[PDB]
Design a protein around this ligand. Structure first.
Ligand SMILES: [Mg+2]
Ligand SMILES: [Mg+2]
Ligand SMILES: [Mg+2]
Ligand SMILES: [Mg+2]
Ligand SMILES: [Mg+2]
Ligand SMILES: [Mg+2]
Ligand SMILES: [Mg+2]
Ligand SMILES: [Mg+2]
Ligand SMILES: [Mg+2]
Ligand SMILES: [Mg+2]
Ligand SMILES: [Mg+2]
Ligand SMILES: [Mg+2]
Ligand SMILES: [Mg+2]
Ligand SMILES: [Mg+2]
Ligand SMILES: [Mg+2]
Ligand SMILES: [Mg+2]
Ligand SMILES: [Mg+2]
Ligand SMILES: [Mg+2]
Ligand SMILES: [Mg+2]
Ligand SMILES: [Mg+2]
Ligand SMILES: [Mg+2]
Ligand SMILES: [Mg+2]
Ligand SMILES: [Mg+2]
Ligand SMILES: [Mg+2]
Ligand SMILES: [Mg+2]
Ligand SMILES: [Mg+2]
Ligand SMILES: [Mg+2]
Ligand SMILES: [Zn+2]
Lengths: 52, 138, 186, 201
RNA sequence: GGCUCUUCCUAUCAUUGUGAAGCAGAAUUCACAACGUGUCGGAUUGUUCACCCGCUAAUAGGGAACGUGAGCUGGGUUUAGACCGUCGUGAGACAGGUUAGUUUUACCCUACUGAUGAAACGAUGUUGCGACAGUAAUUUAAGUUAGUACGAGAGGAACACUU
RNA sequence: AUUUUUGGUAAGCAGAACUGGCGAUGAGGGAUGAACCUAACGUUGAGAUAAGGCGCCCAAAUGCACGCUCAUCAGAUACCACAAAAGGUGUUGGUUCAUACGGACAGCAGGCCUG
């Protein structure tokens, strides 16, 4: 409802990055993981975007 | 497709009188005379504690004496009368002189029309179809 | 290796007055007075001149060096904070169930009801120096104003977070109260 | 199942070739040591990338074919078959055994073949043009992962699979001192009987 | 081997709080902090295992001299009786079936469970403090939320409140 | 046991070679302990040592100077009580190629360029 707002929510929710190792959601456009378990691992992916 | 789905509320506390293996009369005209008690629903026990049913419970049973179409299968039944004295909010303890049950489908429907003998109060609130088929309800 | 001297320079503009005693910083401007305690760092906070404030750290290691610029920036925030305040706007976002809101007159507390149709009552008490407001024209928004950046941003936070949706796909639901506008000057 | 490579890793034995003392030693899963365009001229593929085993160990033939197939698919897809000559320098000569009542005598039947590698022995060699050097370096590295422990990747300043330094190679180009067979180059000395030298044709 | 009982492990079956999804909902899958609590009733089998019938939040995998015979039990295994089969000329033999076949001792030390209890800064009561030790509650269902959100439909939640 | 060795996936496994040693052997050091390190023993005092130590248990430096390290799983050393492939924008060195007031990197700008 209200795409003006959906924008907002989606930027708070779908717009992050995920750690291929500890699973944490890191800020988008970020290089490293902030969680100790993996030693800040390189490999990250985009949190899977919703459907159309 | 199983369970007790057609139960209308909470069943009151009754002293459990029918452990597993218990054989009780079958008061419906289904054509089965008796019910051999296999399990009782909603029970997780202690070590070697026999599963027990009482008035109002829904058991899982088989038919030992009756129409050959009925025996040899696993059916569900609902306990009506029990001989194990239980106690009611007035402090009086009651019992019937037989242990009786009625074969029912998991939805709470009876297979049959007439129910022989009285049905205990504690069974009615829980099972409205059973209650519908009661001649008397104590 | 270990760094000799590192400094950072904080400007002080019209109508601002600053006090450094034993690492305890005070900043008084038109809008009020804010104080913060830096006792945790070994840094030198130099007596402020109405022009400037000089921060120095001696014989430092890479980790220590960062504390400087960060204490500094915090000061920047105290200053800018007492000049033009800080205002945030939080858009209140719901798909089906309208989020119902009751904010007190102090502006010190918020009640949120009917979130995702939940029957629960949300209670959020705003931090000191923070005022919450909603007007008729706000079009489903909240406004948090105050002098101290932290208390305001944090109040926004506590609000946004109280409403996090749970045990369902977060990308479809998206109900919540989110910050639309940050670091506004009034 | 096949025994874990960590069993035969260290070379504890004296070398057990397939010999007239060896009956019923099986084959080795790596049958082909050359991939790519094998027909190329020293002129066509100037630069070499080598996988050099840094460790002293026994690599299983199966492991070889593994690393090889890998490096091949990588190279063929990412550049072109035309653009790389891939050669496996090492061969799996050594025969492992496996002892399959009690210990009465333990001498085993033949399990499989391995290549005995020593520190600094070149495992793989690829020759390519400059634009492709990286890609080679890339796939080789990947094949290093099909391998026991440590191996390293290197770029040689010599010419293709030749023994000449690109400088010597170029000078000898200029002076018409070079003769070309495939990956090989021949150099011409003053020691030759004159019935050979081109001039007395 | 089972019965009985206690404790430990975590490579967590369930329960708590979360991250991830080819997560719409429901269900499910991958991962994290994590055993704190729980992990059941019967067919056949001496059984460990296995297979089935069931209930369940779940019916997790393990350790402790393959935990536990001066705790039982003695079905199995492995003396001496005896049947069959196969082997041996035979006496006899089976890593093959059958059937009958003993289960001893604690009053010692420790250990644990409980129970009295001498004696220093005088004796003897009464009322207290509290070091330390042990700790305990865990789940489930119903009403309501609600035929609701989500979803084309089929289907189908949750928090609060109450019992 | 050192070194060398064969069978074996391997073993505190099974075999061999040279020199020792342990058995047959105590003393100090490896907390501990047959075969390690020093060192070989009559009774006794002094002195200076080896191996190993000198914050306390413990004799003797909380000595004097360097470099490096913060662990919500630090580390603490021969034989010795195990760790690998693989990873880190933690921190410090070094290697090889690069930029910069003929104004760089980055950010904000603005129309590849420009403030
Ligand atoms: Mg990793
Ligand atoms: Mg019977
Ligand atoms: Mg039992
Ligand atoms: Mg989740
Ligand atoms: Mg779901
Ligand atoms: Mg775990
Ligand atoms: Mg897995
Ligand atoms: Mg049983
Ligand atoms: Mg045992
Ligand atoms: Mg016998
Ligand atoms: Mg015969
Ligand atoms: Mg026999
Ligand atoms: Mg005695
Ligand atoms: Mg005692
Ligand atoms: Mg007294
Ligand atoms: Mg007293
Ligand atoms: Mg007292
Ligand atoms: Mg305590
Ligand atoms: Mg409910
Ligand atoms: Mg030597
Ligand atoms: Mg030996
Ligand atoms: Mg020697
Ligand atoms: Mg010697
Ligand atoms: Mg002897
Ligand atoms: Mg000696
Ligand atoms: Mg002396
Ligand atoms: Mg000191
Ligand atoms: Zn991570």
């Amino acid at each position: 409802m209200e795409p003006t707002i959906a924008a907002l929510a989606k930027k708070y929710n779908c717009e992050k990055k995920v750690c291929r190792d500890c699973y944490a959601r890191l800020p988008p456009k970020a290089t490293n993981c902030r969680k100790r378990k993996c030693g800040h691992s390189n490999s990250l992916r985009l949190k899977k975007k919703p459907k159309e | 497709a199983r369970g007790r789905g057609g139960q209308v509320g909470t069943k009151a506390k009754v002293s459990l009188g029918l452990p597993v293996g218990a054989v009780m009369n079958c008061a419906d005209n289904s054509g089965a005379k008796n019910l051999y008690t296999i399990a009782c629903f909603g029970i997780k026990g202690h070590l070697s504690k026999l599963p027990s049913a009482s008035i109002g419970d829904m058991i899982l049973c088989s038919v030992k004496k009756g129409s050959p179409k009925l025996r040899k299968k696993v059916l569900q039944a609902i306990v009506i009368r029990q001989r194990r004295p239980w106690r009611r909010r007035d402090g009086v303890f009651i019992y019937f002189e037989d242990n009786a049950g009625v074969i029912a489908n998991p939805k709470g429907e009876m297979k049959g029309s007439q129910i022989t003998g009285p049905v205990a109060k504690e069974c009615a609130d829980i099972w409205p179809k059973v209650a519908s088929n009661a001649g008397s309800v104590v | 290796m270990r760094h000799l001297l590192t400094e950072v320079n904080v400007p002080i503009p019209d109508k601002v007055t600053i006090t450094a005693k034993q690492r305890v910083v005070e900043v008084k401007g038109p809008l009020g007075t804010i104080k913060r305690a830096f006792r945790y760092a070994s840094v030198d906070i130099q007596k402020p001149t109405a022009d400037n404030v000089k921060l120095q750290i001696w014989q430092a290691s890479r980790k220590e060096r960062a504390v400087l610029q960060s204490i500094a920036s915090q000061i920047k925030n105290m200053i800018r904070g007492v000049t033009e305040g800080y205002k945030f706007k939080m858009k209140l976002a719901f798909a089906h169930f309208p989020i119902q809101e009751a904010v007190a007159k102090d502006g010190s507390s918020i009640e949120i009801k009917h979130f995702l149709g939940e029957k629960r009552i949300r209670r959020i008490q705003a931090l000191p120096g923070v005022k919450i407001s909603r007007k008729d024209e706000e079009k489903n928004t909240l406004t948090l104003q105050g002098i101290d950046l932290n208390n305001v941003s944090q109040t926004c936070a506590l609000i946004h977070q109280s409403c996090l949706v749970k045990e369902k796909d977060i990308r479809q639901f998206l109900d919540g109260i989110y910050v639309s506008d940050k670091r506004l000057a009034m | 199942g096949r025994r874990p490579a960590r069993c035969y890793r260290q070379p504890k034995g004296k070398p057990y070739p397939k010999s007239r003392y060896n009956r019923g030693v099986p084959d080795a899963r790596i049958r082909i040591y050359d991939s790519g365009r094998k027909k190329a001229t020293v002129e066509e593929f100037p630069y070499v990338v080598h996988i050099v085993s840094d460790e002293k160990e026994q690599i299983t033939s199966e492991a070889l074919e593994a690393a090889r197939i890998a490096a091949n698919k990588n190279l063929i897809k990412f550049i072109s078959k035309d653009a790389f000559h891939l050669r496996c320098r090492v061969h799996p000569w050594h025969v492992l055994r496996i002892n399959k009542s009690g210990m009465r005598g333990a001498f085993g039947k033949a399990l499989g073949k391995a290549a005995r590698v020593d520190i600094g022995s070149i495992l793989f060699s690829v020759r390519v043009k400059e634009p492709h050097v990286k890609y080679a370096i890339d796939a080789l590295t990947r094949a290093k992962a099909k391998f026991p422990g440590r191996q390293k990747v290197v770029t040689s300043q010599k010419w293709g699979f030749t023994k000449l330094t690109r400088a010597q190679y170029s000078r000898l180009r200029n002076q018409k001192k070079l003769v070309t067979d495939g990956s090989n180059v021949k150099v011409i000395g003053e020691r030759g009987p004159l019935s050979r030298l081109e001039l007395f044709r």
